[PDB]
Motif scaffolding. Structure first.
Motif, PDB file in Angstrom:
ATOM      1  N   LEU A  30       0.821  -1.204   0.000  1.00 25.85           N
ATOM      2  CA  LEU A  30       0.000   0.000   0.000  1.00 25.85           C
ATOM      3  C   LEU A  30       0.864   1.267   0.000  1.00 25.85           C
ATOM      4  N   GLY A  31       2.167   1.115   0.219  1.00 27.06           N
ATOM      5  CA  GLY A  31       3.084   2.250   0.259  1.00 27.06           C
ATOM      6  C   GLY A  31       3.968   2.155   1.478  1.00 27.06           C
ATOM      7  N   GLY A  33       6.013   4.536   4.813  1.00 23.85           N
ATOM      8  CA  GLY A  33       6.412   5.756   5.515  1.00 23.85           C
ATOM      9  C   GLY A  33       7.926   5.768   5.589  1.00 23.85           C
ATOM     10  N   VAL A  38       4.015  -0.764   4.226  1.00 27.62           N
ATOM     11  CA  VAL A  38       2.693  -1.160   4.724  1.00 27.62           C
ATOM     12  C   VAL A  38       1.970  -1.989   3.658  1.00 27.62           C
ATOM     13  N   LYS A  52       1.700  -3.411   9.151  1.00 26.33           N
ATOM     14  CA  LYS A  52       2.912  -2.637   9.264  1.00 26.33           C
ATOM     15  C   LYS A  52       4.060  -3.607   9.560  1.00 26.33           C
ATOM     16  N   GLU A  69       5.418   1.067  19.685  1.00 21.91           N
ATOM     17  CA  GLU A  69       4.326   1.471  18.775  1.00 21.91           C
ATOM     18  C   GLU A  69       3.130   0.538  18.958  1.00 21.91           C
ATOM     19  N   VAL A  82      -7.331   4.469  14.737  1.00 24.70           N
ATOM     20  CA  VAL A  82      -7.275   3.137  14.081  1.00 24.70           C
ATOM     21  C   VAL A  82      -7.122   2.017  15.113  1.00 24.70           C
ATOM     22  N   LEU A  98      -3.319  -3.796  11.836  1.00 23.05           N
ATOM     23  CA  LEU A  98      -4.137  -2.613  12.062  1.00 23.05           C
ATOM     24  C   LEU A  98      -5.403  -2.571  11.209  1.00 23.05           C
ATOM     25  N   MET A 101      -7.473   0.929   6.320  1.00 24.87           N
ATOM     26  CA  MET A 101      -8.093   2.209   5.991  1.00 24.87           C
ATOM     27  C   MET A 101      -8.028   2.392   4.477  1.00 24.87           C
ATOM     28  N   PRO A 159     -12.844   6.122   0.280  1.00 20.93           N
ATOM     29  CA  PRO A 159     -12.799   7.386  -0.472  1.00 20.93           C
ATOM     30  C   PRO A 159     -14.141   8.119  -0.554  1.00 20.93           C
TER      31      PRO A 159
HETATM   32  C1  LIG Z   1      -1.188   7.449   8.565  1.00 21.65           C
HETATM   33  C2  LIG Z   1      -0.053   6.738   8.600  1.00 21.65           C
HETATM   34  C3  LIG Z   1      -0.061   5.250   8.414  1.00 21.65           C
HETATM   35  N1  LIG Z   1       0.028   4.599   9.710  1.00 21.65           N
HETATM   36  S1  LIG Z   1       0.066   2.961   9.617  1.00 21.65           S
HETATM   37  O1  LIG Z   1       1.084   2.497   8.626  1.00 21.65           O
HETATM   38  O2  LIG Z   1       0.359   2.438  10.993  1.00 21.65           O
HETATM   39  C4  LIG Z   1      -1.528   2.440   9.130  1.00 21.65           C
HETATM   40  C5  LIG Z   1      -2.433   2.034  10.100  1.00 21.65           C
HETATM   41  C6  LIG Z   1      -3.698   1.600   9.735  1.00 21.65           C
HETATM   42  C7  LIG Z   1      -4.075   1.581   8.407  1.00 21.65           C
HETATM   43  C8  LIG Z   1      -3.172   1.982   7.426  1.00 21.65           C
HETATM   44  C9  LIG Z   1      -3.637   1.970   5.976  1.00 21.65           C
HETATM   45  O3  LIG Z   1      -4.724   1.460   5.682  1.00 21.65           O
HETATM   46  N2  LIG Z   1      -2.827   2.617   5.129  1.00 21.65           N
HETATM   47  C10 LIG Z   1      -3.113   2.803   3.829  1.00 21.65           C
HETATM   48  N3  LIG Z   1      -4.204   2.362   3.202  1.00 21.65           N
HETATM   49  C11 LIG Z   1      -4.148   2.769   1.932  1.00 21.65           C
HETATM   50  C12 LIG Z   1      -5.004   2.596   0.847  1.00 21.65           C
HETATM   51  C13 LIG Z   1      -4.666   3.154  -0.394  1.00 21.65           C
HETATM   52  C14 LIG Z   1      -5.590   2.953  -1.613  1.00 21.65           C
HETATM   53  N4  LIG Z   1      -5.931   4.217  -2.289  1.00 21.65           N
HETATM   54  C15 LIG Z   1      -6.673   3.826  -3.514  1.00 21.65           C
HETATM   55  C16 LIG Z   1      -7.297   5.031  -4.244  1.00 21.65           C
HETATM   56  C17 LIG Z   1      -8.179   5.868  -3.308  1.00 21.65           C
HETATM   57  C18 LIG Z   1      -7.364   6.280  -2.084  1.00 21.65           C
HETATM   58  C19 LIG Z   1      -6.756   5.046  -1.382  1.00 21.65           C
HETATM   59  C20 LIG Z   1      -3.484   3.870  -0.537  1.00 21.65           C
HETATM   60  C21 LIG Z   1      -2.630   4.047   0.540  1.00 21.65           C
HETATM   61  C22 LIG Z   1      -2.972   3.485   1.772  1.00 21.65           C
HETATM   62  N5  LIG Z   1      -2.372   3.484   2.954  1.00 21.65           N
HETATM   63  C23 LIG Z   1      -1.092   4.168   3.163  1.00 21.65           C
HETATM   64  C24 LIG Z   1      -1.167   5.327   4.165  1.00 21.65           C
HETATM   65  C25 LIG Z   1       0.127   6.131   4.015  1.00 21.65           C
HETATM   66  C26 LIG Z   1       1.399   5.275   4.157  1.00 21.65           C
HETATM   67  C27 LIG Z   1       1.683   5.028   5.645  1.00 21.65           C
HETATM   68  O4  LIG Z   1       2.841   4.186   5.803  1.00 21.65           O
HETATM   69  C28 LIG Z   1       1.338   3.937   3.410  1.00 21.65           C
HETATM   70  C29 LIG Z   1       0.001   3.214   3.563  1.00 21.65           C
HETATM   71  C30 LIG Z   1      -1.892   2.426   7.782  1.00 21.65           C
END
Ligand SMILES: C=CCNS(=O)(=O)c1cccc(C(=O)Nc2nc3cc(CN4CCCCC4)ccc3n2[C@H]2CC[C@@H](CO)CC2)c1
Length: 295
Positions: A30-31, A33, A38, A52, A69, A82, A98, A101, A159
């Motif tokens: 998902l990407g 930090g 993640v 994570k 954490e 969360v 977690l 989201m 979204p």
């Molecule tokens: C806010 C910081 C992240 N904290 S965390 O890594 O501990 C965490 C905790 C709980 C949930 C999540 C999570 O669900 N992250 C996440 N979900 C993503 C979904 C998408 C899909 N996109 C498709 C098009 C419409 C918009 C969504 C994209 C990125 C998602 N992320 C990211 C959050 C930012 C970083 C954080 O490391 C990577 C993971 C992340």
């Protein structure tokens, strides 16, 4: 086995809910930090989660940071923070599980969902603000100082309509619990924090003001065209940001109260929620059109 105390109760690694590694499947990245990568995962109608990960190539201090954490997130119990499903710390690489989201981070959302040639309305922005203020009130009620309230650290359930915003990162609070200059969130910090290193719940009020600015600007970087030191001197000398484009007056006035120089003059989160609620019920606020970004 470092101990962690929150809301007057102590916890240790033994309290974390260990999920067997064989119950956990990774689906996609998902990407990232700064904190490893993640993934989307599933736990065995399996349960969809965010996973994570801790790099296997890491220091003993990174290991302790990751444990801390896990303990921090696991002790919170609130709809705008969360959830932690559990952990898998007994196999490598280590996992924290977690609440998934699916809407991703708030800053990215705001930038990508800007109205262009009906996607967002003022009420959507006010709901996001209410949700985060609700999470912040819960922290304040429980005497937890977050230290990094910012759009990048908030997440969205989905979204589309019905999205709920939640606080999703506690990395700065974790670092301080376990305790560089260029990595400090200067642009979100009140004078007494970056000067004396004094943090209170009125610190998070200030940062929330900056988050409000980020939300109503639709994801712009605070203090446009200013570096960290320039912001530090600007804020310390009484400088405050201008209203975001088309920001209703009543919403701007929440920002300026959050940024009162003296912490005592800043509202607590109960008051902030009351003011957000008033904005939300006010036709002249919610009928204000957001700017349309040309494309
Ligand atoms: C806010 C910081 C992240 N904290 S965390 O890594 O501990 C965490 C905790 C709980 C949930 C999540 C999570 O669900 N992250 C996440 N979900 C993503 C979904 C998408 C899909 N996109 C498709 C098009 C419409 C918009 C969504 C994209 C990125 C998602 N992320 C990211 C959050 C930012 C970083 C954080 O490391 C990577 C993971 C992340």
């Amino acid at each position: 086995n470092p101990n962690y105390s929150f809301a007057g109760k102590t916890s240790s690694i033994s309290d974390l809910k260990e999920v067997p590694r064989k119950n956990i499947t990774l689906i996609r990245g998902l990407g990232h930090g700064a904190f490893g990568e993640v993934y989307e995962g599933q736990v065995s109608s399996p349960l969809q989660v965010a996973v994570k990960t801790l790099p296997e190539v890491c220091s003993e201090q990174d290991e302790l940071d990751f444990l801390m954490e896990a303990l921090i997130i696991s002790k919170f119990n609130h709809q705008n923070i969360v959830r932690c499903i559990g952990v898998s710390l007994q196999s490598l690489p280590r996992f924290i599980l977690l609440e998934l989201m699916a809407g991703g981070d708030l800053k990215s959302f705001l930038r990508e969902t800007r109205p262009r040639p009906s996607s967002l309305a003022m009420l959507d922005l006010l709901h996001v603000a209410r949700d985060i203020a609700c999470g912040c009130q819960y922290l304040e009620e429980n005497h937890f100082i977050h230290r990094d309230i910012a759009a990048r650290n908030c997440l969205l359930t989905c979204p589309g309509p019905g999205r709920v915003a939640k606080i999703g990162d506690f990395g700065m609070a974790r670092d301080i619990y376990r305790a560089g200059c260029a990595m400090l969130p200067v642009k979100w910090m009140p004078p007494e924090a970056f000067m004396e290193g004094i943090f209170t719940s009125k610190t998070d009020t200030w940062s929330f003001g900056v988050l409000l600015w980020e939300i109503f600007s639709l994801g712009y970087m605070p203090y446009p065209s200013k570096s960290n030191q320039e912001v530090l001197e600007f804020v310390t000398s009484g400088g405050r940001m201008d209203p975001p484009k088309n920001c209703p007056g009543p919403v701007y006035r929440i920002m300026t109260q959050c940024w009162q120089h003296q912490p005592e003059d800043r509202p607590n989160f109960a008051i902030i929620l009351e003011r957000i609620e008033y904005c939300t019920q006010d036709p002249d606020v919610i009928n204000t059109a957001l700017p349309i970004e040309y494309g």
